[PDB]
Write a protein that binds this ligand. Structure first.
Ligand SMILES: CCC1=C(C)/C(=C/C2=NC(=C\c3[nH]c(/C=C4\NC(=O)[C@H](C)[C@H]4CC)c(C)c3CCC(=O)O)/C(CCC(=O)O)=C2C)NC1=O
Ligand SMILES: CCC1=C(C)/C(=C/C2=NC(=C\c3[nH]c(/C=C4\NC(=O)[C@H](C)[C@H]4CC)c(C)c3CCC(=O)O)/C(CCC(=O)O)=C2C)NC1=O
Ligand SMILES: CCC1=C(C)/C(=C/C2=NC(=C\c3[nH]c(/C=C4\NC(=O)[C@H](C)[C@H]4CC)c(C)c3CCC(=O)O)/C(CCC(=O)O)=C2C)NC1=O
Ligand SMILES: CCC1=C(C)/C(=C/C2=NC(=C\c3[nH]c(/C=C4\NC(=O)[C@H](C)[C@H]4CC)c(C)c3CCC(=O)O)/C(CCC(=O)O)=C2C)NC1=O
Ligand SMILES: CCC1=C(C)/C(=C/C2=NC(=C\c3[nH]c(/C=C4\NC(=O)[C@H](C)[C@H]4CC)c(C)c3CCC(=O)O)/C(CCC(=O)O)=C2C)NC1=O
Ligand SMILES: CCC1=C(C)/C(=C/C2=NC(=C\c3[nH]c(/C=C4\NC(=O)[C@H](C)[C@H]4CC)c(C)c3CCC(=O)O)/C(CCC(=O)O)=C2C)NC1=O
Ligand SMILES: CCC1=C(C)/C(=C/C2=NC(=C\c3[nH]c(/C=C4\NC(=O)[C@H](C)[C@H]4CC)c(C)c3CCC(=O)O)/C(CCC(=O)O)=C2C)NC1=O
Ligand SMILES: CCC1=C(C)/C(=C/C2=NC(=C\c3[nH]c(/C=C4\NC(=O)[C@H](C)[C@H]4CC)c(C)c3CCC(=O)O)/C(CCC(=O)O)=C2C)NC1=O
Lengths: 160, 161, 49, 160, 161, 161, 160, 160, 161, 161, 160
């Protein structure tokens, strides 16, 4: 969490929490309900967003979607979509937390190794994340979309 | 380390499912308590020296530990005792801000008993001192902050083993 | 230089020992310095002085 | 600034500013006007604030200003007031900054060594800052007192 | 390092006087610019890799520098060139948010020219690439953000040459 | 660490006599078998990544371990699992080339079972996957190379123990 | 050269080059004549082998040739072929040298980073190198080809 | 073994054995028969070579053999001869192994300190080894003498 | 470092074209010279200590430098002189066996004159000793080997000059 | 390393001569005045904190240096300034005990002027602070010992300017 | 000097000279007159002591003086004796200083390497130093011989 990151820095410094750091935690408390509301909206529209983003991703990377790609056949495409769904759930968890560190633990560590082991294309995964960002902008308020877009941008960097 | 929000996230990850409404209610309760916890942590930092002084005086002032051969009868041992007590207070304070004692247990309670056994320090006497510090800290912070601080101090007492 | 690019040469077995806790950071440094990776980047090209 | 502290953490992390870190920077941008107003109030009431604080500190510890004390005599008492004024100006800078970064580099690093060399009592200096905190709370709005009190409190803790 | 607010605070500390009206409006200018800065920073992070790719394509790709014997005509050399460009871009984005060139002076531009010279990497080639990156960055960030990003990147390019 | 020839030399050194004619005959037979083993080992190195992927598909793909909470159901956990399999394969390749599994037991198997038990990773399940990988590798490498692969896999079974 | 690598190890040991290492150098001196004949064959088939292997690689990865792929258009396809040709020349130089380290320094060290910037697909490049190895097996005598295939395989492994 | 030393280097690299290194190992497999035959001849003539080398060493260092020397007396001379024969047997073992490193690990590490404890002169021990090397070169074939000379040169460096 | 075959490869890489047949003939000449160089290098290592002693006797022995206040007149100074000569011999042997002088320039030469100037050691005296070492090394190695090793030693002396 | 007695020995070693009568007389003078030097050095160490306090009060305090922008305006700079005076005194007293001004040049005065110039410390202010320390140290040590201490203090000032 | 060595240790520890170290300096100064008187006596009788010790050393090690030893011939023996004379002067300097540091700087730093380079026998050199020590102990007064014996013993240990 944001508190976890700030406390980690303070513990390394071996100092009680600074006034500004405490203020940051207080801001998290103030905006916790709004963050939870955005996360609840994401969970509510999770299935529809997954479907729409999947269509956009297949359009962007037809070879992977087609036979002779990583998502060759309905079963392979379904497994790919399930992995993308796990990404989306992790993104929702990170958005609720307010810190990208939980999402990094879930998916970012060894992401290149996992993609190489599967054989699938990392750039296509990133494009799917971008499609999810557009859908989230449609389904969120402008202030909510900006924060969700920032977490999704960290996800895009993780895909790279 | 771990925090309250991180613990909820860990439970959701183990489930492999999106956050439940009841789990979200638990998170909302943490958000509600955060304001009082943060103000209490700021108060603890401001009066940290006073808390240490009062607790040390109640625990071991004018005692055999201070008297020659009492293991706190050297100036170095006296300073080291204060250092260990201050570290206990500070780490527990950070854990109180988090709302989760896992960080305190992992960071401070790992191997502490073995190290204290090698040192020869009385863990039980330290536990009595920590309980006295919990009483003083509860008095200075207030009732609401004292209850959480007491729970964290009880976790420290369990780690004393 | 960047600090964001540990290139290929990194020693993952040393990382694994450190993660497990079997290797302390001091020992990690000694293995990394002894390895041919450090030698190639520093010892062989630059003069001993 | 709070942005400066976040930048230092990011430089150590070798990563672009975190989305949550940028969010706190956004909060600092929002609170710039309120922080500036609070700082203006402190600067406006500067002479009376530290005058009352000096009286309170000398009342609490009369040996600072008594014969044989560090500040015995009019000139040394004025120098003691200057040291308090240095701290007050640093607190105003820090309130504008929104972070402990301004104060830590000036008056919170090595201050114990400097005061020990000159002979002034560190605990009495800390009490003087506390007296300033009480005066500032009296002279500021309730939530303005909370924020200003937080920055003051970090200064007091540093003296410890 | 320094910030816009921190630098004004430093100047006020040098003067030895509490916040002036001039200090207030300099700080207020930074406060107003903050919204533009943070939005641009998010965009820069999102399109950072694409920015590097576009810049080298516009300036140094498909040229003799890429062709054999051009200081970029190896897999390792090419990776190093992209790395140094990313280093400059990241520190420049930091510095744009900070509002002051102290960060770039302290870290980005310390001994860089001498090291580049001794290696033999062309300072002029780096300067051309930096200007191309500035053009791409201004397009992505926006007009108001591009003006500020131009100032920071200009400091890096001028210091290199 | 000990080579096969080095082990014969060590026995002769302990005896205090020059290497026996029978020991020399064993060394000559080792050289003759080593030529074929070396060719197959080069083949194994070329297809090492494919062998790892095939084993993971045989067991790990579409498995409860992949499902959340299965001790490989994380990005870090998945990277570590694949890396451990590859490291076992590389050490086994060295052991097969040497003709002695002493090096693999000395480092790769030194407390590896105890560490895995502490971690909670299923040693027997990993051993079953390793046996499947050994069978596929033996088929690709050949019957004579499969015999050496069987010795390495037997060391892997001991590591499971 | 293999002698250069042995000299580096000896320098780290702070010892004169080992008698066994010198014997290894003599052995490669013997191997160099046959290697030179093989290298002459490689130079003879510099262009024809490249064309045949390139056709195989294009068949393997049609999407890259398709618009929107890395090698989209005649110019991009020519650049892809030129990169493959540069790799082939590096393979010939490394085979003559006997040490894969010369090939590694020229390319495949940071090549993944270069590919990430350029947009090139590492899997298709690796498959093309493997196809070049198969074509080379037909092109050259088996005894010479076995060593050459290993050099090509080292490049392929670095790519993967 | 030489293959074992290459394997140790490969393990430090954490990569499969180098193509040239594997080729060198194959050459060692071919060379094993010649090594065995030469070693058998050396073992057959080991006792005679030891006696001849001992006579040459006594001629070189009459003072050592005479009273006031390390080998003064029959018992001291016999211990000297036993040390020389043990080193000769170790040399045969190292030549058979084909790895100078195994011989160095077994003996000649700290051998100067061992000779200091015994009181014997390191230069005189070296001269005895040189006489043994000449006898071994005569006893062995010209190809065998070349390898034996290299092992003897390593022993000479250890002696010095 | 760099080798003779590597230098031919470097020239071909700078050109961009594959190795020419004539360039391969130059490499073949290096291969032919390597056999004699290798045998001579083994001889040089065996008599390296004697060569150093002979050169030291030729110049340093019975010299004013050895006499008190001559800059070679200390136990540390004499040990340092011996060590420096040994290091030069080791680098020269590596250069001669390799057949390329790039290694000698890369490690020994860079700032060797500057370091000697800072230390105050006499560069001319070291150069004369280097010539004496070259003569002894040529005698031990042989005429053909002496030309190559002598040329490398002359190159080091020329850099010192 | 250099001391007064050691320097006499070192000069004799350069000559190679046995101890001369002049060398014996100089060494005897060092032996003779060691008593006064030793007693004063102990007094200096005992009153070291008071001396630096007196020196800054007499020279470096209540001026623009400690007022804003004076290179001592901040607590960090002040702490470094009193620390620098403390080091100056400590190595100076080391050297005063030794009797030889060479030691301070080896440690205190090696690159000190360049470092101070780079950081912006006022060379003149440091020199006057050193002179103020000289007065205070002379007062505490006494005239006979202070005169000896003053020579080596003045050597430190000469190195600075 | 002994005071110099103590000062070196104190500077490394970053502390003013210890009271015990100051007491060491006071004692050395008080005993300095006797120390230099003993040193002057050693210098006065240095030549005669050198001749007697050289005869004793040659008697103990005739082989070194004889052909086939380091001091083979009158010229080689003369160079040997000159080295001994330099060591004797260094021993006198160390005794005068009251610390072994002057002798250690002049010799025994790399002295083993110098002896190995020259071929001269270290044990024989040590025995010669011991013979000089015995003669010098007889020559000097009992109090002076006691200190001289300790310095000579340190030299003998360095020789061994
Ligand atoms: C063997 C080394 C050693 C020392 C020295 C030491 C000191 C020491 N001083 C103490 C208290 C104290 N020390 C002082 C000291 C002073 N107050 C003044 O006005 C004076 C300036 C000054 C002494 C001259 C006072 C007043 C207390 C009691 C504090 C209190 O009870 O509130 C205590 C706690 C009470 C106790 O003794 O149980 C200890 C342990 N402990 C050690 O192990
Ligand atoms: C000498 C070569 C070598 C070996 C063999 C080795 C083993 C090894 N594997 C580890 C981790 C691991 N190993 C696995 C492996 C698996 N999970 C599964 O579900 C499968 C059944 C299985 C693979 C077949 C996992 C998941 C971890 C990470 C555990 C964690 O820290 O979370 C760790 C802990 C430290 C770390 O790397 O993070 C070690 C030391 N280390 C070495 O240096
Ligand atoms: C000496 C070592 C070395 C190498 C190898 C190297 C390669 C290299 N390949 C390039 C381009 C490229 N490389 C590829 C590669 C491929 N596209 C595909 O579909 C295939 C799978 C694959 C090859 C078979 C492509 C498509 C480009 C052009 C990229 C673009 O501009 O759109 C470029 C950038 C353009 C330029 O040359 O300026 C370089 C530098 N540079 C070096 O210094
Ligand atoms: C203060 C921050 C900082 C800087 C500036 C820095 C630069 C820096 N650049 C270097 C090399 C280099 N830099 C380049 C970069 C380029 N190639 C080109 O064609 C372009 C004109 C140019 C930039 C786009 C290259 C090719 C090398 C040498 C790589 C090699 O051959 O080993 C090196 C030598 C070590 C190495 O090879 O990486 C350093 C230290 N390091 C730092 O810590
Ligand atoms: C909690 C973090 C986490 C993630 C994300 C994860 C992913 C993951 N992705 C997998 C495979 C896969 N992943 C993909 C991915 C893709 N193929 C495409 O064409 C697209 C471009 C892309 C997604 C849109 C595919 C195709 C497979 C199956 C591999 C195959 O059988 O060919 C597998 C192996 C099969 C299985 O699930 O058992 C896992 C475990 N594992 C984790 O622990
Ligand atoms: C200040 C410290 C210091 C010392 C001691 C020193 C010694 C020293 N001894 C030398 C030679 C020698 N040293 C010896 C020594 C001995 N031979 C014996 O039989 C005896 C056991 C023994 C003496 C008691 C001999 C025989 C030589 C001449 C070697 C030769 O040139 O053939 C040489 C080489 C010739 C020369 O002086 O140029 C040096 C430098 N150099 C120094 O800077
Ligand atoms: C890469 C291989 C390599 C070389 C070549 C090298 C040179 C080298 N020679 C040195 C010293 C030295 N070199 C000499 C050499 C000589 N004095 C003479 O009278 C002669 C003319 C001459 C020898 C032929 C001396 C006397 C010193 C020590 C300087 C001193 O402290 O007085 C030092 C200073 C550190 C030390 O004491 O070792 C270096 C670094 N270092 C290296 O790592
Ligand atoms: C930016 C950080 C910073 C600060 C704060 C600072 C203050 C400061 N306070 C000083 C003195 C002093 N400070 C005190 C302090 C006190 N006496 C008391 O009774 C009270 C308990 C207490 C203050 C409330 C006194 C008495 C002096 C004068 C000392 C003397 O001359 O006897 C001095 C030395 C005299 C001078 O100004 O030259 C400085 C520099 N300097 C700095 O660089």
């Amino acid at each position: 969490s944001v508190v976890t990151k700030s406390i980690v820095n303070a513990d390394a410094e071996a100092r009680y929490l600074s006034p500004g750091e405490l203020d940051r935690i207080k801001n998290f408390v103030s905006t916790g309900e709004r963050r939870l509301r955005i996360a609840q909206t994401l969970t509510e529209n999770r299935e529809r967003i997954v479907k729409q983003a999947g269509d956009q991703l297949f359009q962007k990377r037809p070879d992977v979607v087609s036979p002779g790609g990583n998502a060759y056949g309905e079963e392979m495409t379904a497994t790919c979509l399930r992995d993308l769904d796990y990404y989306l759930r992790l993104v929702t968890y990170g958005i609720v937390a307010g810190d990208v560190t939980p999402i990094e633990e879930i998916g970012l560590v060894g992401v290149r190794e996992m993609y190489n082991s599967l054989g699938t294309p990392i750039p296509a995964v990133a494009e799917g994340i971008r499609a999810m960002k557009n859908v989230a902008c449609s389904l969120l308020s402008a202030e909510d979309a900006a924060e969700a877009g920032s977490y999704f941008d960290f996800v895009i960097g993780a895909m790279q | 380390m771990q925090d309250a929000i991180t613990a909820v996230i860990n439970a959701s990850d183990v489930q492999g499912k999106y956050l439940d409404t009841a789990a979200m209610e638990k998170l909302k309760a943490y958000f509600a308590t955060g304001e009082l916890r943060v103000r209490a942590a700021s108060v603890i930092s401001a009066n940290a020296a006073n808390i240490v002084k009062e607790a040390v005086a109640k625990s071991l002032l004018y005692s055999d530990i201070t008297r020659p051969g009492g293991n706190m009868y050297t100036t170095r041992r006296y300073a080291a005792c204060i250092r260990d007590l201050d570290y206990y207070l500070r780490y527990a304070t950070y854990a109180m801000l988090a709302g989760d004692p896992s960080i305190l247990d992992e960071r401070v309670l790992n191997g502490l008993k073995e190290t204290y056994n090698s040192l020869g320090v009385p863990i039980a006497a330290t536990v009595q001192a920590i309980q006295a510090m919990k009483e003083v800290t509860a008095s200075l912070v207030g009732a609401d902050a004292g209850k959480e601080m007491g729970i964290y101090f009880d976790y420290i007492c369990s780690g004393l083993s | 230089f960047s600090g964001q690019v540990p290139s290929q040469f990194r020693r993952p077995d040393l990382e694994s020992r450190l993660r497990n806790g079997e290797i302390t950071v001091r020992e990690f440094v000694r293995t990394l310095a002894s390895s041919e990776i450090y030698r190639n980047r520093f010892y062989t090209p630059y003069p001993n002085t």
